[PDB]
Design a protein around this ligand. Structure first.
Ligand code: CLA
Ligand SMILES: CCCCCCCCCCCCCCCC(=O)OC[C@H](COP(=O)(O)OC[C@@H](O)CO)OC(=O)CCCCCCCCCCCCCCC
Ligand SMILES: CCCCCCCCCCCCCCCC(=O)OC[C@H](COP(=O)(O)OC[C@@H](O)CO)OC(=O)CCCCCCCCCCCCCCC
Ligand SMILES: CC1=C(/C=C/C(C)=C\C=C\C(C)=C\C=C\C=C(C)\C=C\C=C(C)/C=C/C2=C(C)C(=O)CCC2(C)C)C(C)(C)CCC1
Ligand SMILES: CC1=C(/C=C/C(C)=C/C=C/C(C)=C/C=C/C=C(C)/C=C/C=C(C)/C=C/C2=C(C)CCCC2(C)C)C(C)(C)CCC1
Ligand code: SF4
Ligand SMILES: [Cl-]
Lengths: 40, 31, 137, 37, 729, 78, 734
């Protein structure tokens, strides 16, 4: 368990997790509110 | 009018002056 | 009249012809129509594409100013929390290992506290904790 | 490849000299001098 | 052994490295064995005489071949339709197809078309016959001879100047400001008034009659009476036909502004008053420094007096630092000349001075590209010799706590901030281009990020351009700047609002993005060059870099960590960015003008906001005629440029070999070749004198950079000329 | 068009047996390691061959028989 | 034979959270950013992690199990997206009017435009992998069958992972098990290749052939019986193939002639589909199976009979080679790198052969007339083969540095090769120079002559001719072979050699590929580039240990320089070899693309006239460099650069993406770490000034890594550029 937790805390897993989470937010926002070129 | 043959040849003769002087300057610089 | 070379999109003949054929960018069948209405408020060139004004006039604050404020808040947040985490682990026995094996409980604490970074940055600057003295490095 | 310009025979002489003799004399003199002593 | 005579160490090298390095260090006089400071200056002074003579001979050739083999007399009768001829072609390798293709411009033999603009230049300054061109060519031969003799003379014992003579900065500045600049400008104004202007009005003025032909009917009495307004009355009318008296005036000095309606170039009378006006300023400026009569300024006093509490010693002791360092002086000269050369390029295309040159599109493109590339090379050289100054001449003690020393103190701040701005520009400029590419690719061009270059448009408005409706200063009729009654304003406002010239071209979002791309190139090239100069004296990686030299061999045992850090390596890297920056700006200039010349400015305006537009509309589209210069169906006049186009591509690629591979691979390969030679019967009898060796690490980078640069220039030159020449005559 | 092949008959059997006999004889004279591994129930009748040698020669015999039978059938000699 | 150790390595997650555990140096943790790069570079260099050959072998054996699991997951995906996100069923019912598509993108930020109309109302990305053609040949008729195959692949992937874990953490074979090369060859010849081909032959006979025969006869896919129905009711098979009425008796009695109705030697191509006759492929795999199974009883394992590979090698020695092949058995049974070097060289060469043979003898139905699939398959497998061959040079050099023991190789072939290495390279050096001058010089000659308006002086069919007479002779023999040297073959092996034009749906599937002066010139360009690439890699292997730089083996395979002595390591030769392999293969695929469009592919008129894609311009244009620039690159790039706003816009984007990465790589290739380290110092100062300097000290990339990064980005940029160029072009011509 401790070894697995440390593995999931390694730099590559963490950055990919954050990028995946960040990508999801941006994609989902553009799925519902697309084409925002400027603040109305 | 177009340049004559003598004018073209005359320029070549005049060009021997800088050629000779260039040789002297280059040799002097080589010293 | 400033921007006389430009024209509002709602009055630009090129925009009107093209805006009727805007492609749908999502699964919503009206997404192309919505974009046509939204961009109608902007200034368009002869080709009919919106142009952005960033000279500072507040009538176009939505072009660059509002996006700029949002980015700087997010950017400063990312930098500030990363700096805070880096400084704190520097006080441990093995700081290097905590940079390649993240201390997730500590990182989450720092990340959740980044919304006050502009105030924290001001406080550190006044307290001499933001900038190191040249003689110190 | 003739020429209506005056003294059109000059290229027949100068270009071979500039193209053949000058490089040949230059290369010969430089290589001999560079490979001397 | 013998060669090089100036380096005993190189002469003793038993390998082929002796030959290469002897050539590469021939003109680095400072490092020659036994060189003294006094002999250094005298050798440089003589060498400068040689360079000036070469320039005159080069100019003499241009005049001679035009007069001999050109069509100048035919061209002047119809400048807008006749193509000027550069020189005849005599190539025995030509086939039947090539002979016919290059028999052009009305010639009876194969010829090349001139794109240097000399025809327009010679015609504008009043030359109208082959005889006049021939006379100028002969005159320059004599002038070249005089300087060749002067160089030889001033190397003789009695005529060698002393070291103190070369160090007399105040005297040289006075003479060269008042005399070299001022009097020359005054003399040119004389040529314009007495020769060029009368010729433009159909009046022949030459050496035979200029003494009996006053340039103005009023004579010189108004000049000495103060009634100078007479020389501006009755200017050339808008209907004047250049070279004839139809519509011609009598004024010799004017301030009309704008362009001559027919020739689409600046008024000669304005140019005359211009060169007269600056001559007065330069002559006055040349009386500032004290030489022999007590009056005047001492440069040392001025520098030592300008110091404040925020810059330590300020400008103290910089007179000695600059006056004693030739590399510092050369750096300043190259930097100043580099800036001026760009200014020439920028202002000659927008404010042409030569009649009908604005309609010779290929010539305009060639001239702008030529001088911008020269400017780029000069700028790199200025920083290179700035770095050399720090390595060789900079004295920390003398410059203690002055502005120069403090630059080295905050170098980390300088380099780090230059790094940020380069990253700042690069990330966001590239990002916007890619954003536009993707949205356009997905069929949604309306989603592009198009930023209006408002600031630049505003500047155009301040000069009177009313297109943008900013209504500011000269664009505002009620502004105090507009109601001054300036003579030039009516002409200038017409020119800037005509829309039929290159004066303040209308700009849009496409111009915005490329201008920031140019800023990226400028800042990044400066970053590389500035880092090299400031780190030349040492860094943390190599604290003792100063005592190794500008370029040092890094292949010695134990010197693995000394590679790529010499100040020379910074120059090597900066060259790529200088070429890249020049490529971006020349692409920008050419593509924009292609639309302006053809009237289809919409193409650049709409397609320059994404990179596929440059790739497709500029590169791919304009290559069609070039690559058809020769094809399975025949050849045309672009065959040479097509062949040169591939030649440049080949030379460029050949450079990759030297830049990518390293010495070790080739040294062992050569050993096998040496092994084969020594064992081949009847061939091992022939023995080399210099042992073949692979190129040194520095040499390979220099050779690779040379092939890269040559291929870079040749490729674009062929494309630039062929694409423009094919479209427009 | 297609090469001729033969429906089975005693003639085919004779060729296959003959080829197997040749393979056995050839193996007995050429195999270097004959009685290695699993032995036979009575090696006297197999010339000292082990199980591997018995199967190897028989397998080689079937291959030779197939080639000969098909080859002779192709030429019509069988 | 079988010998394992029980539970040698406990299964525990402890080392998962300790990166770099496998290396003693890295296990101590990072001090500089160089540690991060070293961790990934040395992850799978097992022999440097442990000195025991048995331990190295065990890691390799289970590692190879992991790779198989990865491949199965990839295969499972292809079948799954074919089952769920494809128009396979629609295409199967109308292959000549529907284009294959098996990838559908989500409609986000306007990328839905990539879902182009491929026919039948389906929208998606058109695939060039040829999966539909493979699946049709296999007998697939409905999505459920593809779905079942996808599930099976995942099960196999799971089994491979379990086997990898089991055979490392539970039951690890001993070294003696791995070194039983005689047994391995027997099993992998007779078992893997033999039974694999026999099993597939049974599949084709019982499944592929009957289903495809009905499909080729115009029977709707839904009306075709399922594969098992032909087995449950053999009368269905008898109707299609009467010989099945006689059962298996003919097989056992050697009366094989009766099976001629489904085991054929037709040759040529199926007129309906334009692919190989499935009856021919069935007899092919049946004949191959017999050959491999026989070949697999060659080596002695446990019953005396068979050859000893060591004995065979030691016997082959001659007067010109001293000890000859003695000692090689020891090398190949104790050095994994030596084995990998051989296998990479042959497998890479094999992949190239696959590309060459598959295009000219299209095995799958409708593959030939899908020019995008034809071009994609040829180009793809050409690149794979080229990379593997370069790997052979890399791991050949690694063997010399690490595993070659001179004391154990005295006067044998390997030792003798190192003795005359100067002679080898010097002569190989000359032939490369000769080929370069007399191959590329011809193009330069032609460019100059054409530019000078002297077409009559060029090397061309209408000018001085260079006819590849030997190749023309071979084509003539292969055209005459049916009935004369292959009497029982009804048609030529490939119509590329000569004969009739095969047209399907009004498009050319294959036709004679004539060879002329342009073909002669380019073929000798290939000889030049291949010889040079071999020179660089062979030189790397021969000079990996010694010189200039003696005792090079001490430094190792990867070292920056010795002590100029930079770019002398075995690795550095791989770095240069990659560039030349890229250069060599780029011309090959360009040769293929232009020749096929110019002289093979096109539309066939009802009367019979053929209109080629580029109207036969190869003969007169491919003889100058300008022709390649103008008629191939500039002309055919029009499709990719005009792709914006269409379903092909993605290729336009990737076309620019490739150009960028190529240019980006030049930053690494032209520079060195010294400059970047000094730049980092100034940047570090700024970070220090704000108390935000990292604990892991930033470092510039090592000298070797900078070269590795440069070549990696260079090849990626160049290959991606061609990929987008080819797919956009081929998807637009038909
Ligand atoms: C197209 C080619 C190319 C590119 C893109 C760059 C880019 C850069 N160079 Mg380089 N350079 C090049 C060619 C190139 N160079 C060549 C041919 C040479 C001659 C040897 C040099 C020599 C050189 C020097 C000497 C210097 C630079 C510097 C720079 C920086 C300039 C600032 C900038 O633009 O920041 C913006 C950054 C970029 C444009 C980089 C690309 C960013 C990408 C597109 C986004 C991130 C991608 C992400 C990581 C995904 C990774 C892939 C995958 C795993 C997902 C930047 C990193 C200077 C520097 O370092 O300044 C700080 C510097 O000193 N370059
Ligand atoms: C937009 C155009 C391009 C901008 C590029 C970026 C410029 C960034 C400049 C940042 C400050 C530079 C260091 C100032 C360091 C400093 O304190 O300088 C102070 C110094 C004036 O102080 P002093 O009275 O001591 O000056 C005495 C003089 O004789 C100079 O020695 O200069 C200035 O104030 C102007 C600097 C202009 C720089 C241009
Ligand atoms: C072949 C000749 C051949 O097969 O020779 C065969 C001969 C090997 O002779 P042996 O009878 O000793 O061979 C015993 C074998 O079992 C190998 O140990 O090879 C040499 O002596 C090397 C000669 C290389 C000579 C240079 C060849 C360069 C390439 C030429 C390519 C032409 C196309
Ligand atoms: C005594 C005296 C006075 C009287 C002066 C008189 C009565 C006449 C003076 C005439 C003068 C001072 C003429 C100077 C002419 C200079 C020339 C002509 C220089 C040319 C130089 C170059 C380098 C030319 C280059 C070129 C050539 C040759 C071409 O053909 C093509 C263009 C270009 C490439 C530019 C006054 C009372 C007034 C003042 C006090 C002294
Ligand atoms: C490293 C080094 C060096 C080098 C340097 C360099 C190379 C530099 C450059 C620099 C540069 C390259 C600069 C530039 C500048 C510029 C400027 C500063 C400008 C200004 C302008 C102005 C001010 C203007 C104004 C105006 C306007 C805009 C409009 C109209 C009016 C007027 C005129 C008012 C040296 C040698 C020193 C030595 C030491 C070290
Ligand atoms: S140049 S340090 Fe770089 S490789 S020489 Fe070695
Ligand atoms: Cl051509």
């Amino acid at each position: 368990m401790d070894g697995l937790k440390s593995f999931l805390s390694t730099a590559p897993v963490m950055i990919m997790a954050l990028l995946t989470f960040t990508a999801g937010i941006l994609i989902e926002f553009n799925r519902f509110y697309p084409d925002l070129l400027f603040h109305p | 009018m177009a340049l004559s043959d003598t004018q073209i040849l005359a320029a070549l003769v005049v060009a021997l002056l800088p050629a000779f002087l260039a040789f002297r300057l280059s040799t002097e610089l080589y010293k | 009249d400033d921007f006389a070379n430009l024209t509002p999109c709602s009055e630009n003949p090129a925009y009107l012809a093209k805006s009727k054929n805007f492609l749908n960018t999502t699964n919503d069948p009206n997404s192309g129509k919505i974009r046509a209405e939204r961009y109608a408020s902007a200034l368009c060139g002869p080709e009919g594409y919106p142009h952005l004004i960033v000279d500072g006039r507040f009538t176009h604050a939505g072009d660059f100013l509002i996006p700029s404020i949002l980015f700087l808040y997010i950017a400063g947040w990312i930098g500030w929390v990363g700096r805070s985490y880096l400084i704190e682990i520097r006080e441990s026995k093995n700081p290097e290992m905590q940079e390649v094996v993240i201390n997730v409980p500590l990182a989450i604490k720092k990340m959740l506290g980044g919304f006050l970074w502009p105030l924290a940055a001001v406080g550190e600057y006044t307290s001499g904790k933001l900038v190191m003295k040249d003689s110190e490095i | 490849m003739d020429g209506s310009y005056a003294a059109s025979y000059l290229p027949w002489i100068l270009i071979p000299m500039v193209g053949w003799l000058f490089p040949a004399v230059t290369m010969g003199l430089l290589f001999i001098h560079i490979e001397s002593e | 052994t013998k060669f090089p005579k100036f380096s005993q160490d190189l002469a003793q090298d038993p390998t082929t490295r002796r030959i290469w390095y002897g050539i590469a260090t021939a003109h680095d006089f400072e490092t020659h064995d036994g060189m003294t400071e006094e002999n250094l200056y005298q050798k440089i002074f003589a060498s400068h005489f040689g360079h000036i003579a070469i320039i005159f001979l080069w100019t003499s050739g241009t005049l001679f071949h035009v007069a001999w083999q050109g069509n100048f007399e035919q061209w002047i009768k119809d400048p807008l339709n006749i193509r000027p001829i550069a020189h005849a072609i005599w190539d025995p390798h030509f086939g039947e197809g090539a002979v016919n293709a290059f028999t052009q411009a009305g010639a009876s033999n194969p010829v090349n078309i001139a794109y240097s603009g000399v025809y327009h230049w010679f015609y504008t300054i009043g030359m109208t016959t082959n005889q006049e061109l021939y006379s100028g060519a002969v005159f320059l031969l004599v002038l070249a001879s005089l300087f060749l003799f002067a160089g030889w003379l001033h190397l003789q014992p009695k005529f060698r100047p002393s070291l103190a003579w070369f160090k007399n900065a105040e005297s040289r500045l006075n003479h060269h400001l008042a005399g070299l600049f001022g009097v020359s400008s005054l003399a040119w104004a004389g040529h314009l008034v007495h020769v060029a202007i009368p010729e433009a009005r159909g009046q022949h003025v030459g050496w035979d009659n200029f003494l009996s032909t006053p340039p103005h009917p009023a004579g010189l009495m108004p000049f000495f009476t103060g009634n100078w307004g007479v020389y501006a009355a009755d200017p050339d009318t808008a209907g004047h036909i250049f070279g004839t008296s139809e519509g011609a005036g009598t004024a010799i000095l004017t301030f009309l502004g704008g362009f001559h309606p027919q020739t689409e170039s600046l008024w000669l009378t304005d140019i005359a008053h211009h060169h007269l006006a600056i001559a007065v300023i330069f002559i006055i400026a040349g009386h500032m420094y004290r030489t022999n009569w007590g009056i005047g300024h001492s440069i040392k006093e001025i520098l030592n007096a300008h110091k404040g509490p925020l810059t330590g010693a300020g400008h103290t002791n910089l007179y000695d630092t600059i006056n004693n360092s030739l590399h510092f002086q050369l750096g300043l000269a190259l930097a100043s000349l580099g800036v001026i050369t760009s200014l020439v390029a920028q202002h000659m295309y927008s404010l042409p001075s030569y009649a009908f040159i604005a309609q010779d599109h290929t010539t305009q493109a060639a001239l702008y590209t030529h001088h911008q590339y020269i400017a780029g090379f000069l700028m790199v050289g200025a920083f290179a010799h700035g770095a050399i100054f720090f390595v060789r001449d900079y004295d920390p003690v003398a410059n203690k706590d002055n502005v120069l020393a403090r630059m080295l103190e905050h170098k980390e701040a300088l380099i780090s901030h230059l790094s940020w701005v380069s990253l700042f520009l690069g990330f966001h400029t590239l990002g916007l281009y890619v954003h536009n590419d993707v949205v356009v690719a997905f069929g949604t061009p309306e989603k592009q990020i198009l930023i209006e270059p408002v600031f630049a448009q505003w500047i155009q408005a301040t000069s009177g351009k009313a297109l943008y409706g900013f209504d500011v200063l000269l664009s505002n009729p009620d502004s105090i700047a507009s109601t001054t009654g300036a003579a030039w304003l009516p002409g200038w406002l017409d020119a800037i609002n005509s829309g039929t010239n290159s004066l303040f071209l209308t700009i849009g979002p496409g111009d915005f993005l490329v201008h920031h791309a140019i800023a990226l190139g400028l800042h990044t090239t400066a970053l590389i060059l500035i880092k090299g100069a400031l780190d030349a004296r040492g860094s943390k990686l190599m604290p003792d870099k100063k005592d190794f030299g500008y370029s040092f061999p890094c292949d010695g045992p134990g010197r693995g960590g000394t590679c790529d850090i010499s100040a020379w390596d910074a120059f090597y890297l900066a060259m790529f960015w200088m070429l890249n920056t020049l490529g971006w700006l020349t692409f920008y200039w050419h593509w924009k003008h292609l639309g302006v010349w053809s009237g289809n400015v919409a193409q650049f305006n709409e397609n320059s906001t994404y990179l596929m537009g440059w790739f497709r509309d500029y590169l791919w589209a304009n290559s069609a005629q070039l690559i058809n210069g020769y094809n399975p169906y025949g050849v045309n006049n672009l065959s040479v440029w097509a062949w040169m186009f591939l030649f440049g591509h080949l030379v460029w690629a050949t450079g990759f070999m030297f830049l990518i591979s390293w010495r070790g691979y080739w040294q062992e390969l050569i050993e096998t070749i040496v092994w084969a030679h020594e064992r081949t019967p009847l061939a091992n009898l022939v023995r080399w004198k210099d042992k073949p060796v692979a190129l040194s690490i520095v040499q390979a980078r220099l050779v690779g950079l040379a092939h890269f640069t040559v291929g870079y220039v040749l490729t674009y030159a062929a494309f630039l000329i062929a694409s423009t020449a094919g479209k427009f005559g | 068009a297609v090469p001729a092949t033969l429906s089975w008959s005693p003639k085919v059997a004779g060729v296959m047996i003959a080829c197997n006999i040749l393979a056995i004889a050839f193996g007995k004279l050429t195999i270097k390691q004959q009685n290695v591994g699993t032995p036979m129930p009575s090696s006297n009748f197999f010339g000292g061959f082990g199980l591997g040698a018995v199967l190897g020669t028989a397998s080689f015999g079937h291959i030779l028989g197939a080639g000969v039978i098909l080859g002779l059938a192709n030429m019509g000699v069988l | 034979k079988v010998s394992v150790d029980n539970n040698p390595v406990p299964t525990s997650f402890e080392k998962w959270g300790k990166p770099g555990h496998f290396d003693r140096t890295l296990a101590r943790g990072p001090k500089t950013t160089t540690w991060i790069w070293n961790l990934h570079a040395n992850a799978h260099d097992f022999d440097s992690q442990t000195s025991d050959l048995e331990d190295v072998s065990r890691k390799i054996f289970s590692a190879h199990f992991g790779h198989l699991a990865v491949v199965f997951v990839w295969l499972s995906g292809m079948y799954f997206h074919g089952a769920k996100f494809s128009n396979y069923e629609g295409w199967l019912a109308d292959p000549t009017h529907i284009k294959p598509s098996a990838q559908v993108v989500w409609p986000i930020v306007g990328q839905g435009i990539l879902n182009g109309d491929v026919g039948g109302g389906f929208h998606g990305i058109q695939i060039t992998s040829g999966l539909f053609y493979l699946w049709r040949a296999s007998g697939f008729t409905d999505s459920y069958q593809l779905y079942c195959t996808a599930i099976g692949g995942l099960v196999m992937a799971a089994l491979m992972l379990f086997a990898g874990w089991f055979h490392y953490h539970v039951k690890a074979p001993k070294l003696e098990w791995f070194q039983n090369v005689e047994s391995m060859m027997n099993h992998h010849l007779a078992g893997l290749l033999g039974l694999g081909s026999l099993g597939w032959a049974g599949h084709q006979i019982h499944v592929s052939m009957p289903i495809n025969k009905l499909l080729d006869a115009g029977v709707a896919p839904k009306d075709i019986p399922l594969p098992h129905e032909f087995i449950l009711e053999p009368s269905k098979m008898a109707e299609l193939y009467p010989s099945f009425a006689q059962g298996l008796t003919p097989f056992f009695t050697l009366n094989w002639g009766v099976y001629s109705d489904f085991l054929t030697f037709k040759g040529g191509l199926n007129p309906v589909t334009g692919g190989l006759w499935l009856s021919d492929t069935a007899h092919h795999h049946l004949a191959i199976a017999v050959l491999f199974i026989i070949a697999g009883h060659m080596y002695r394992t446990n019953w005396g009979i068979g050859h000893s590979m060591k004995e065979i090698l030691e016997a082959h020695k001659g007067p010109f080679t001293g000890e000859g092949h003695k000692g090689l058995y020891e090398i190949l049974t104790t050095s994994w790198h030596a084995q990998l070097a051989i296998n990479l060289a042959l497998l890479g060469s094999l992949t190239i052969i696959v590309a060459q043979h598959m295009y000219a003898m299209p095995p799958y139905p409708y593959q030939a007339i899908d020019y995008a699939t034809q071009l994609s398959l040829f180009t793809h497998h050409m690149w794979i083969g080229g990379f593997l061959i370069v790997g052979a040079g890399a791991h050949g050099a690694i063997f010399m540095v690490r595993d070659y023991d001179p004391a154990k190789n005295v006067n044998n072939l390997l030792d003798r090769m190192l003795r005359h290495r100067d002679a080898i390279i010097s002569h190989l050096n000359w032939v490369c120079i000769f080929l370069g001058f007399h191959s590329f010089g011809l193009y330069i000659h032609n460019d100059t002559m054409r530019a000078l308006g002297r077409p009559q002086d060029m090397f061309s069919d209408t000018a001085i001719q260079l006819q590849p007479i030997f190749a023309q002779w071979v084509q003539h023999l292969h055209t005459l072979a049916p009935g004369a040297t292959a009497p029982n073959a009804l048609a030529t092996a490939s119509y590329a050699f000569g004969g009739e034009t095969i047209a399907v749906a009004g498009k050319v599937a294959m036709m004679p590929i004539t060879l002329g002066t342009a073909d002669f010139m380019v073929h000798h360009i290939h000889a030049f580039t291949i010889h040079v690439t071999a020179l660089i890699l062979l030189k790397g292997v021969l000079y990996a240990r010694s010189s200039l730089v003696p005792d090079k083996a001490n430094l190792g395979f990867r070292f920056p320089c010795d002590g100029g002595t930079c770019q002398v390591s075995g690795w550095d030769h791989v770095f240069l070899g990659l560039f030349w392999m890229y250069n060599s293969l780029s011309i090959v695929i360009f040769h293929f693309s232009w020749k096929m469009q110019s002289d093979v592919w096109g539309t066939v008129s009802p009367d019979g006239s053929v209109t080629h894609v580029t109207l036969g311009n190869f003969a007169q244009s491919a003889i100058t460099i300008n022709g390649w620039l103008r008629d191939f690159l500039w002309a055919q790039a029009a499709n990719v650069i005009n792709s914006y706003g269409s379903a092909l816009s993605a290729y336009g984007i990737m076309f620019l993406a490739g150009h960028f990465v190529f240019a980006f790589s030049l930053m690494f290739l032209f520079s060195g770490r010294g400059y970047w380290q000094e730049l980092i110092e100034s940047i570090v100062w700024a970070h220090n000034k704000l108390n935000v300097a990292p604990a892991i000290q930033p470092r510039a990339l090592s000298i070797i890594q900078g070269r590795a990064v440069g070549v990696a980005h260079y090849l990626l940029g160049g290959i991606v550029t061609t990929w987008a160029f080819f797919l956009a072009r081929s998807l637009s011509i038909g």
